[PDB]
Amino acid sequence: ERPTFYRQELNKTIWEVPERYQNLSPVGSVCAAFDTKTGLRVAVKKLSRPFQSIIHAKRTYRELRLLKHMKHENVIGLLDVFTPARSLEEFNDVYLVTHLMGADLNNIVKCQKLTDDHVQFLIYQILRGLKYIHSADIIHRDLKPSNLAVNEDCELKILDFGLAVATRWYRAPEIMLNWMHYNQTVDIWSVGCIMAELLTGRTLFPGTDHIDQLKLILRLVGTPNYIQSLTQMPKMNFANVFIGANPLAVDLLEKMLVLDSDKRITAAQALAHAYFAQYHDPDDEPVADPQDQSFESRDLLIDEWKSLTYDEVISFVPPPL
Template identity: 60%
Template sequence: MSSPPPPRKGFYRQEVTKTAWEVRELYRDLQPVGSGAYGAVCSAIDSRTGTKVAIKKLYRPFQSELFAKRAYRELRLLKHMRHENVIGLLDVFTPDDTLDDFTDFYLVMPFMGTDLGKLMKHEKLSDDRIQFLVYQILRGLKYIHAAGIVHRDLKPGNLAVNEDCELKILDFGLARQADSEMTGYVVTRWYRAPEVILNWMRYTQTVDIWSVGCIMAEMITGKILFKGSDHLDQLMEIMKVTGTPPPEFVQRLQSQDVSILGVAGGASQQSGPELVQWDSRGLGLMGEPTARWETGPCLTQAKNYMESLPELEKKDFASVLKNATPLGKEGPSSQSFLASVIFF
């Protein structure tokens, strides 16, 4: 078996978790961070600045038209994202010499440390942190939605969080323009809105708001809100909380699975005991799509809710999040600090 050709000038090759990575020499100390269905991520040190970055290698981005479209969408959107709650692109490169050899490319982004899913597995989130994280998600979504984009894959694993509790929305491989025809199975099942599960081909940005509601409930209770074993079971889990959708909703769907909506005919809108205090805050994120909040009104509601809270006891920010950067002796109260990040 012949050996692979030597790396292109200015690049070096390293094996990471049994996969060959070929990256620019200025990115040193590759360390595996995680992997998914479409790619893997390593951390590295940018030798020019000494800062840690995240490098994403897409798996076989050109093996099919579907993979190529996903790779193109992610690259195109990342290139234009400029918001503190949305991940941006620092660099993009290929180790291939010519267009004929072009099979791989790498995306370089800021390194965030962890994601919301991992964070929730390791600790119970306090109310003030939940508020701060949810508002950052909404701020990032407002920016994305204002550009006419539906993310379509919001989940805890796609929300990066650093040690200062700063959050950025990740992974735009499934994002689409809101006016284009959609496909049904795009969001991780537990965070899908009913119209996505049922192949409603013209759904809107409100599917992202549904995902935020699911994520918010999970942060508060420590449990996945709708944990269906397949897409039909997922609908049943949803209806146990929201009740059977009204006939108008059913009439607008385009799926052979619509009949299942009659199975839970006696279901009423109810919540588990952990969500009693959450209902008034969070159920506006759920419900029938035309009645579901959009990010603008949602942020207004969120801000009004924050302002109605009693003053929170002042805390050392390092005690809220371990290894966090303190706000200083004269820093703002937790409530006013959280309120200060909501501005438009």
């Protein structure tokens, strides 16, 4: 049951891992390995400093639990979680294992010319995935082409949250102006820009800095403070803009790239949209199981949070095959 572990020096860090994980190679805390058992390419993350203090011990607990909970075909899943520790008394480090995908959306877009057929399929999957994360009270906030992975079968997974500027390009306006209580539809704005890049092959808002990213946005959607001082920009007609896009692609877009986060279509509404008629299937578009958050109101010592995390690691069961 317990694997043989081996040890290794990598970026001034000694990694200790089960012997199934071979060829460890860091990228930028995170190593790519080859899982000889499963013949699968994997990423292995070793956690930075769990149990650092009390607020981290607790954050490590909460987020491990959130991650264990993820089970959906369009969302990164946990293949494995382990520690070389042989007892709670010596438990310090925690390792996470997920599979490494092969391609992602940015390397794809920068190499091949997609048809509307390809686009409809990719976005459906992204939205189906987004429906699920949102339903689990999560707000991803860095949705970008490089963190949208696709494997051989063209199955796409959303990758990069509770885990780890090209991002500013896909960021919702309200996220750049330090709103404090922003909405889940910040993620739908991201989808809209990704979608626009799929339809055309080009970056919609390739802006350098904050205010300038924003000048570029105003130039598409027209002007809605330092804004009561910004130039008059009239609203562009999206059909005149996206020369080729299925007029259904354009209507969905018109509803994603809206400034008022209150009027922006949700993940669930967008799935029901006529652009997705061939894939839309309401009885296989599931939401997250309720999770218990009793611990959320507990006030324990660091070795209690560590005790609990330990027990989560130990109890983890991997995906069947």
